[PDB]
Design a protein around this nucleic acid. Structure first.
Ligand SMILES: [Mg+2]
Ligand SMILES: [Mg+2]
Ligand SMILES: [Mg+2]
Ligand SMILES: [Mg+2]
Ligand SMILES: [Mg+2]
Ligand SMILES: [Mg+2]
Ligand SMILES: [Mg+2]
Ligand SMILES: [Mg+2]
Ligand SMILES: [Mg+2]
Ligand SMILES: [Mg+2]
Ligand SMILES: [Mg+2]
Ligand SMILES: [Mg+2]
Ligand SMILES: [Mg+2]
Ligand SMILES: [Mg+2]
Ligand SMILES: [Mg+2]
Ligand SMILES: [Mg+2]
Lengths: 123, 252, 151
RNA sequence: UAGCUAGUAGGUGGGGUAACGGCUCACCUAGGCGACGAUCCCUAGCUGGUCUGAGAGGAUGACCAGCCACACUGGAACUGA
RNA sequence: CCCGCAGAAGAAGCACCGGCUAACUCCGUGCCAGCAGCCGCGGUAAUACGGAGGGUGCAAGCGUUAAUCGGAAUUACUGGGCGUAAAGCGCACGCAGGCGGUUUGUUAAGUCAGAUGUGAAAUCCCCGGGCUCAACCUGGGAACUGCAUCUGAUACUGGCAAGCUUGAGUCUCGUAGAGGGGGGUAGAAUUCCAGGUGUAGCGGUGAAAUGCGUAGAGAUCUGGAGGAAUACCGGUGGCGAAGGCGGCCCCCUGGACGAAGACUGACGCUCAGGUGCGAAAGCGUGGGGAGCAAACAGGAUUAGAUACCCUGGUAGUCCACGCCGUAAACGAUGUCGACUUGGAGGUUGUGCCCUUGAGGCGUGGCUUCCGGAGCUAACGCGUUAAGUCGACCGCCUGGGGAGUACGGCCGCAAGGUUAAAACUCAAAUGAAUUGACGGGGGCCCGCACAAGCGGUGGAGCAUGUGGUUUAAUUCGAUGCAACGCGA
RNA sequence: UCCCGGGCCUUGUAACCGUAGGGGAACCUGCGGUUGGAUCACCUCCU
């Protein structure tokens, strides 16, 4: 509408949140697994999802996804988390990091292994 | 018409009822076997009314249930619960689920037996339950909730989503329990005076009570009772309503 | 909240005890999904992997004979750093320890609580609620949690 | 977040500073400010710049250079250019 | 930094390979679970899972996360929208604010031109130089959009002065109209009362019942009461800002349009706050209460029926005086002004011609329906724009959460009003296309029916099928469209 | 006309708004305004 309205009130460009706010723009954060559990997604859905309630150093507690194979991971253990969305799951916007401070690499895996926290085979 | 479908909330209701011997328990509207079985199970023996004689045959012929209950086949609004309270040795626990047009009648018939009933435990639709427990100063308040809260203390038990029912309605519904007062906290000279005071008032709920109860009492009576006649009918607690009822009855 | 809680417990007990793990808690919630939550512990330990195992087992062995399957999904869990707990014996392991409780009784001197377990009765939890002490029946409670001190 | 303000706004006179000035003090006037957003509350050191953007813009002020403020916290004041 | 010496000698990884997106096949795998930015991948091969070979990309790095800008015109200064997708205040008046016809002089604030001072250096950019190159460093220029001051310029804008009549507005004469306010009054009508005649029914529904009547109802005649509303005209019709306005007469009163001049002399438009008007419902105070009728009450119906039916019936509906302040208060379309093909009507003035009376040439106003151009997502809109444009105002920025919270304000109370966010979702939405629609609805067709003939269905027996039985009664076909059928 | 299929053109097939009140329901009722008077949608592909 009128330029006179625009000088009476300028263009209100909107703000948006961090969609992964419990990082406070840290590239990663540390926490402890306040509980750990595994879920079927649905009545016919067989693909178990592995998930943790984890409290961060900043006192937030949040859900995070456990990617790939099993671990030692059990409630007194400590975890590094980073941004990442499990698209099918509700609100799961944090991935745990493979090969982090209390976290094993996927020993078996021969492909993409720098994602999975695992060193070059020793050949 | 409806009856429940899902074991989680069936089990929640029958467990929240806490149905055991040492209680004069009677079902009304046993309906589908799934929700009458756990209560007929936990009570060593149980009384029941079904309104339908065909369902009463289905359940009386069921060997889980016919050997484990005593069964009656009639409109419960005919039924002499005051004699059943004598036959059951102590005032009754009356409970269940129904098509509930009859609900409004159920409450009055239960209240005709406030002596003979120890407590009532029933499912009902969300709006009528929230009305039944409504605080005096709310739009949910009104004459039937007044009479209910007069007769009994009233207590929501738990609330149930519509997909929980066998024919699932659109309408969320809750089980509620209520307790005829061991002595009436509001002593009244008569209940017909309450019933007519409340209907006159709520038939006129938008205007001042000077233009509702002041069509019968004077403003100097009302202010003499300590009541501001400039209030609306939905500002008024059951306490001053029973005070008005006593005033009507004793000054007549 | 559960279906047929004893039947469910035994059907779950079969893979739990085949794995040599132990049950702790069974609870179901009704909502956007309707879903079943199993607390398992084993004092050598429960990993995510142990949950994964017993969960894939129950995801078969319950499903094939489900008494109900409405909106269904489930999870199996370690009982948290603040732990849900359910029986006289549980609170008895934890006499002297801080707790929170929510109850089937719902009345003033509020039956929603923070407590330190004072002692256990065969029918009741006795507890230092609000720095006072009082006692609540295992039947008049409905959910409780332990060491809420840990966030 | 709508009204704000009594050394408040202005004046005279005394005192005061290296210097002008409610700077301050006596009196005297009743002003002065604000919806062209005062008052109030939150948040922030500022700037040359930096990043992005075709540009207009948007973001931002680490490093380096200029300015500002602070020096255990809160108060003062000595000395000296 | 140069020089000597020996030897390929001491020195390559990391992503990804379904599409977007360069790069693919074998293998397993079983939806085991893995895979994931998104779209999505998978059971029997999976180019998407895991492994292998093969490939692509980038490289002493390569990937992941976070964060800002981009893309995003996705706040739209440049560079967006508001009939239906989100969006035009229910309406109007009006203060502040913005905007403003036309002619001449004047001014020179804006504006323009030029100058002068300043705009730290570094950075940026250009042109060079120097490190073996590069990064890096560095000379010189350019740049520093600006600010101040001086000087001119005078179109335009602003100021000032003077006018001007086209906008605005006054006057004179008419015209049409449910415009408003106030006061009388009429004929129907219902109910009610009072009789009169009269008598077994009435009333109601699908049928019933409740209801009314032998104290005479119902019916019908007369007489009276009271409250409410204006049959018909009446219209694709008028008036009104909108809400709205309809028997008739009077009284007061608002606006509008045409006629023909005359007059003022830009007096204008828009309008945040502000002010006022504002259906229906409801409230306030005091009347009234015929008919109707939430609530209520009672009879019925129904599996139930709270509905739908009926007999009742209060508030309310009416009036005066307060309030509320909302409506799909919607042309879902802000106000004002200019322009831009046509066509058929309606209504209401007016001029000229009328041969009169009809006519026929014109010519305003209002208004309805078509439709060109253009516009529009499309639907459609279309000189009464949703076309072409000028001034100002209002409003929107994904869907839910939510016009909801909270606070403020306002209200007698209802509530109104202003108005979040967390949280949650990959949509939500508008128009339009093709099937379902389907319940059909019609066009109709044939030994389909009808009109005939001869059967079948009862008897015996041939034959198939079934059931049953058996050591086996082999197996297949089982309504048409299996059953003397494969055979 | 009907009775059986077909072939064929194609429809006998209320929502809301504001507001006030009931309240087994979504709902029922009163007042007056608006018309925006209804459907629903599965097995692959390159020049
Ligand atoms: Mg002085
Ligand atoms: Mg751009
Ligand atoms: Mg390709
Ligand atoms: Mg847009
Ligand atoms: Mg819209
Ligand atoms: Mg409008
Ligand atoms: Mg001008
Ligand atoms: Mg001029
Ligand atoms: Mg009134
Ligand atoms: Mg009214
Ligand atoms: Mg509100
Ligand atoms: Mg025969
Ligand atoms: Mg065969
Ligand atoms: Mg076959
Ligand atoms: Mg044959
Ligand atoms: Mg209207």
């Amino acid at each position: 509408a009128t330029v006179n309205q625009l000088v009476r009130k300028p263009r209100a460009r909107k703000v948006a949140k961090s969609n992964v706010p419990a990082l406070e723009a840290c590239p990663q954060k540390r926490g402890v697994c306040t509980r750990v559990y595994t879920t079927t997604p649905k009545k016919p859905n067989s693909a178990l999802r592995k998930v943790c309630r984890v409290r961060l150093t900043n006192g937030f507690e949040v859900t995070s996804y456990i990617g790939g194979e099993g671990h030692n991971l059990q409630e007194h253990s400590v975890i590094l988390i980073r941004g990442g969305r499990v698209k099918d799951l509700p609100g799961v916007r944090y991935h745990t990091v493979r090969g982090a401070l209390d976290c094993s690499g996927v020993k078996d895996r021969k492909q993409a292994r720098s994602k999975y926290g695992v060193k070059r085979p020793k050949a | 018409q409806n009856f429940l479908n899902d074991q989680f909330v069936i089990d929640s209701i029958v467990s929240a009822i806490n149905p055991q011997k040492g209680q004069a328990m009677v079902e009304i509207g046993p309906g589908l076997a799934a929700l009458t079985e756990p209560v007929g199970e936990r009570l060593d023996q149980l009384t029941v009314i079904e309104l339908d004689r065909d369902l009463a045959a289905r359940l009386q012929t069921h060997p889980f249930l016919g050997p484990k209950l005593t069964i009656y086949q009639q409109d419960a609004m005919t039924f002499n619960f005051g004699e059943l309270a004598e036959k059951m040795g102590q005032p009754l626990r009356v409970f269940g689920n129904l098509p509930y047009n009859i609900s409004t009648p159920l409450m009055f018939h239960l209240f005709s037996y406030t002596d003979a009933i120890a407590d009532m435990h029933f499912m009902l639709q969300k709006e009528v339950v929230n009305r039944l427990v409504a605080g005096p100063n709310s739009k949910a308040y009104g004459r039937l909730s007044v009479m209910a809260q007069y007769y009994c203390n009233v207590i929501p038990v738990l609330e149930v989503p519509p997909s929980a029912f066998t024919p699932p309605p659109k309408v969320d519904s809750a089980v509620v329990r209520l307790v005829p007062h061991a002595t009436m906290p509001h002593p009244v000279k008569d209940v017909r005076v309450l019933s007519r005071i409340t209907t006159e008032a709520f038939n006129q709920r938008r205007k001042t009570i000077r233009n509702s109860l002041g069509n019968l009492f004077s403003v100097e009576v009302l202010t003499g009772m300590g009541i501001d006649p400039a209030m609306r009918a939905e500002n008024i607690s059951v306490a001053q309503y029973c005070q008005m009822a006593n005033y009507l009855a004793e000054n007549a | 909240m559960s279906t047929l809680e004893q039947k469910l417990t035994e059907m779950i007990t079969a893979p739990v005890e085949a794995l040599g793990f132990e049950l702790v808690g069974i609870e179901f919630i009704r909502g956007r999904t309707s879903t079943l939550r199993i607390y398992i512990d084993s004092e050598d330990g429960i990993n995510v992997d142990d949950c994964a195992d017993v969960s894939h087992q129950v995801s078969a062995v319950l499903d094939v004979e489900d008494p109900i399957t409405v909106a269904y999904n489930l999870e199996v869990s370690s009982p948290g750093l603040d732990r849900p707990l359910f029986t006289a014996e549980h609170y008895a392991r934890f006499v002297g320890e801080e707790v929170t409780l929510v109850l089937r009784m719902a009345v003033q001197n509020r039956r929603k609580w923070q407590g330190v377990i004072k002692a256990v009765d065969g029918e009741m939890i006795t507890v230092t609620v609000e720095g006072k002490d009082e006692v609540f029946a295992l039947s008049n409670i409905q959910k409780a949690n332990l060491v809420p001190h840990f966030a």
